[PDB]
Design an enzyme around this catalytic site. Structure first.
Site, mmCIF file in Angstrom:
data_model
loop_
_atom_site.group_PDB
_atom_site.id
_atom_site.type_symbol
_atom_site.label_atom_id
_atom_site.label_comp_id
_atom_site.label_asym_id
_atom_site.label_seq_id
_atom_site.Cartn_x
_atom_site.Cartn_y
_atom_site.Cartn_z
ATOM 1 N N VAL A 129 0.800 -1.217 0.000
ATOM 2 C CA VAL A 129 0.000 0.000 0.000
ATOM 3 C C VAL A 129 0.837 1.274 0.000
ATOM 4 C CG1 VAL A 129 -2.043 -1.014 1.054
ATOM 5 C CG2 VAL A 129 -0.230 -0.124 2.545
ATOM 6 N N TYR A 172 3.155 3.966 16.121
ATOM 7 C CA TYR A 172 1.858 3.330 15.953
ATOM 8 C C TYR A 172 0.717 4.212 16.465
ATOM 9 C CZ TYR A 172 -1.476 -0.536 15.795
ATOM 10 O OH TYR A 172 -2.542 -1.352 15.515
ATOM 11 N N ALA A 173 0.889 4.788 17.650
ATOM 12 C CA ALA A 173 -0.150 5.650 18.215
ATOM 13 C C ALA A 173 -0.387 6.869 17.342
ATOM 14 C CB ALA A 173 0.232 6.070 19.613
#
Lengths: 246, 246, 246, 246
Positions: free
Chosen positions: D63, D154-155
């Site tokens: 992606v 990630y957060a």
């Protein structure tokens, strides 16, 4: 002195966060009106602040009795001609899990923590919009953001005061009156002094600062929000928990 | 038929979202208990559903009267042996600016919208935890997220039901009982026909889908949350507003 | 003088909120390090503050270039022996509807607004944890709470900095280092003079105080959060919007 | 069969939540396009669903490579004439506390979890608004609500995808295209199979349902949100954590 000459009504001011807020407000030059259901204790509290040279007064007010609220507000107007700040700090807890909670436990907490806050805010908000400036500060809780085991009544009430906060911020903001809430976590007031150490350790472990707040650390947030430093802060609930995994 | 044979109690079921939810639950195979303060109307509503082949019943319940709530729950158990789903949808508004709100306006909305929800949830929660599965769904509102002009009382109550939701999700989740809330925006129920067009244009323009919801579109969210498709959804308040700027 | 002698690094300090924050911090007694991509302008800004008697310095820093960030931090340590406060205020917009947004528009905003904030925080966090006290303040936006038309990239970045804020508050809080964010609404900085009146009327009508903020009104929130008055405020994003309906 | 004949592109569909979502979507009658960076594995996955009689196809898509995304979307249009649903599920983690996180760890996660989501949504959103109906579902996380130790990257990314969600819900909602996010907690996919039992016990103790989710329980939420049962759900991030004290 950022609150110089401003008249501040504080409920639940005899002890705890309420008293710490009265002390800080007086240090910032406010005229402080200490209200509490405990008459002897709140007069002693006021007496301690008066000795520092601050301008203060004390009233016995049960916030669930609108006549007592009204009488106090009238007396404050007679004495100081205006009301600039309201801190709706008086609260109670009557914890029980849903399976065990009684109607009286439920009602008592809703009465003080929602109806009481409504009574005091309604009694002063017109004075504030008429003069074109004021601030109403509501005591919520971290429990008013995340819920908590055993606090059906308390959580509903402290969520509910954020509902008040956003609604009143909308209604009163255009007239120069700000409304905000503070959501404290675990604060080292008298209520925690009988809690077992191992239980307190669990509480502080869940706090990202790994310690309980002193009441002065909540008072300092009310003092900011009352001041002109918060002039563009309206309709907010500030979490004062040190960060928490509740 | 994702609710086949499951017993669902719905309050405020005579009309509006409550009736649409009863209709959808019956379509999904649930045994539906329609409760409302309007007895003739909720009886007629149940009759319409029974005509479709649904298993239904109809009770007058004023959720502010715990003896009435308890009696209804006892009757449902006698008839259907268990309670699987509760939808706490009964609610009222008594709108007024803070400046004008009467004590009766305030008290009544807290009574129906908080005390009533407490009463129904407490009445069924033990049945659900004892059997190891159940779901309680509470009606909130976008007003319970963002506040709203003229709704001091309603906003407190719909914030408060999110407090209930998180608290009960914590207490009951470990026993297999989920608790969630739905926060509808503007719904094309009977309460809107009398509303002026320019007020409804303001409503639709503030919605990112640029239209009002049909009641079935809220019912379908309750149906999802009641079903096993929502088995890992607990303690949430789902906004059902099309997106908005309130 | 609540920041007396404390060393504060402010990014994006040549103008706007960044400069107002540098001004306020200096007023509160801080040693201020003004950083910006516009070197001549941030030098002139620092000179204006030095003329008031403040202790200041001025650096060209492109926050997307970690070697530049590191070099500046090293220079500050050499000059002032420690770093007490970081205000991550540098940010950009490159607005476009999703349909039209170019890769460069997307990538650039993520680079300055997320990678830049990461770079500055990582560069100072060890200094702060080693000394047992520090505060990192991240600039978010109301757009980082509610999204906004045409701001796919900006909204992701300002949501993302709240992710940083909560994460770093968890990691660093136990070492005495607080991390918080401010979410301004519509601020009367230089970026608004060119904006059409009817766009600004839409801005002010959506604000519950019915006016734009002055930059000093955001600076004062950073000043509160940097100070010991915010000692139990950690992991929060304070909305500084006057209340709004975005 | 609520997704009958609807064309659904799912990223990260070779295994885990992505595969569970592909399976559920096929059960609900969708035409499912399984995309994954792992070509052999995703073709095996698709083959398993094809054997059930479902209409499915498989593509190798990274992606972060817009050319691969574009080529897949073109191939899907050639094959099925439209795109009705996009599930942006592909994600990665590269955890490290701020003090230790490398630039490559940061970049890799932002690339997949933000840029990848942007690429896929941008590639399909015009097709959806042109046909006047579509739904884009973004994978967030509980970490995108509350932060988490060691997840700076990630957060930020999972907060950031909620920023995308609200922005795209605003831009695309008026054209009949809904955008929502799901925020899973701890899900029993392959990623947890090497986690020590005592660590998993800590995780489940923090969950108010006291257990990990099966991937099918996240898939069922995507299936709801894709369906017409969620026709008035737009711009929301649904927490799918069982309730958590993170």
């Amino acid at each position: 002195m950022k609150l110089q000459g401003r008249v501040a009504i504080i409920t639940g001011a005899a002890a705890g966060i309420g008293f710490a807020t009265a002390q800080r407000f007086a240090e910032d030059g406010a005229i402080v009106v200490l209200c509490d259901v405990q008459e002897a204790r709140v007069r002693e509290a006021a007496a301690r602040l008066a000795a520092t040279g601050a301008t203060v007064s004390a009233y016995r007010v049960d916030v669930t009795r609108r006549d007592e609220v009204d009488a106090m507000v009238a007396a404050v107007l007679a004495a100081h001609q205006r009301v600039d700040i309201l801190v709706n700090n008086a609260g109670i807890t009557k914890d029980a899990r849903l399976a065990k909670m009684t109607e009286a436990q439920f009602d008592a907490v809703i009465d003080v923590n929602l109806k009481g806050v409504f009574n005091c805010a309604q009694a002063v908000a017109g004075l504030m919009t008429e003069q074109g400036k004021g601030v109403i500060l509501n005591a919520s809780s971290v429990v008013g953001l995340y819920g908590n085991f055993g606090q059906t009544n308390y959580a509903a009430s402290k969520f509910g005061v954020i509902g008040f906060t956003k609604t009143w911020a909308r209604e009163l903001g255009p007239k120069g009156v700000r409304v905000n809430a503070v959501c404290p976590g675990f604060v080292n007031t008298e209520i925690l002094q009988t809690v077992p150490d191992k239980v307190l350790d669990g509480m502080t472990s869940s706090c990202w600062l790994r310690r309980l707040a002193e009441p002065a650390e909540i008072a300092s947030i009310y003092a900011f929000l009352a001041s002109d430093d918060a002039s563009y802060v309206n309709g907010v609930a500030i979490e004062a928990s040190g960060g928490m995994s509740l």
